[PDB]
Symmetry: C3
Subunit: 141 residues, 3 copies
């Protein structure tokens, strides 16, 4: 089974497209797409987002990583219009080693949806993220 470290390395070296790996778990030939970041989304990782219990914590931050839906070791966007979260693992594997530690020291921290810069490592916000999100909500499938 393709690790996320292997997927990130192949993407950076133009061996695979982001679209042919699950951005969340690393597996090959996912059925669907992550709507916010360049990358596929497998059926299992897509169902995690749909099947969350509480989507927010008691402080009004999201209870889940925007990329992989993990709830542990979340970095919290300081933009009160956003309140999205990214996990340590996604920062380490998609942006690069040390990103998580650097981000935990930033005061305030702005997430990868809020940053003007579109790409960091193989974490690339979609140019068409808004239309992609509309497409993601359109399908029953």
């Amino acid at each position: 089974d393709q690790s996320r470290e292997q997927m990130a390395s192949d993407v950076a070296n133009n061996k695979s497209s982001l679209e042919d790996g699950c951005l969340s778990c690393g597996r090959k030939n996912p059925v669907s797409f992550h709507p916010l970041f360049e990358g596929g989304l497998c059926q299992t990782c897509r169902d995690r987002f749909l099947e969350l219990f509480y989507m927010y914590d008691d402080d009004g931050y999201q209870s889940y990583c925007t990329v992989c839906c993990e709830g542990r070791e979340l970095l919290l966007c300081s933009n009160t219009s956003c309140c999205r979260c990214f996990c340590v693992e996604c920062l380490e594997v998609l942006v690069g080693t040390g990103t998580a530690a650097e981000a935990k020291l930033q005061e305030p921290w702005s997430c990868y949806m809020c940053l003007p810069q579109r790409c960091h490592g193989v974490l690339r916000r979609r140019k068409d993220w808004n239309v992609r999100l509309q497409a993601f909500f359109t399908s029953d499938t």
Copy 2:
């Protein structure tokens, strides 16, 4: 058992949080959140929005209250890019006594999603309403 009048009074006097009452019906400890306004949303009030038949009337205005999903005594946003509706009861209870009558005299009336001002009484548009609405559409539970 908790009335909406009791919930609004406790919120204004910092006795309870908007998030621990249903903004639509007043019930304590709702399961989810109203996506547009600060406030909880119970399972049954959430199901009203999901189970609407016709969402628009013959004049192109929404057939339901943005807060509680009621069809009776709707005020109609005059912004042709919006066409959302708010009922008399939600205005009276969340904004305050006389709001509906004051709104009927406005030349023209702009709804609480269109007004630059975020808060009126305990009706507070979310700073993160757009991300909250994306979270609301993501959930299949």
Copy 3:
């Protein structure tokens, strides 16, 4: 009004409203609305969008016509923030004869969701398309 050619002609010459025909197939008295363009949407044409499997082709353009969901002869929006598609038939019948041929030679082509001009033939982008699309995603029926 039965064929799409008949519906377009009646609309242009003030015999019918766009809202009383299916924008996708031409059928009279459709149950719902097209969320992006003025026009009804019948149950069958609405179900095409809900039952899409792949929303995107291998080049990151949408796999379906924005208006009718079929097409096969898709024109591709050149805006990398959009990547929507419109079929030859929808352009010929809603905008007018020659539109498809003109659009295939245009370098680059901007689709009817991107163009500043709201109206071309009987194709009118909704003033409230964003709120209409939120209403479209709200219904679980």
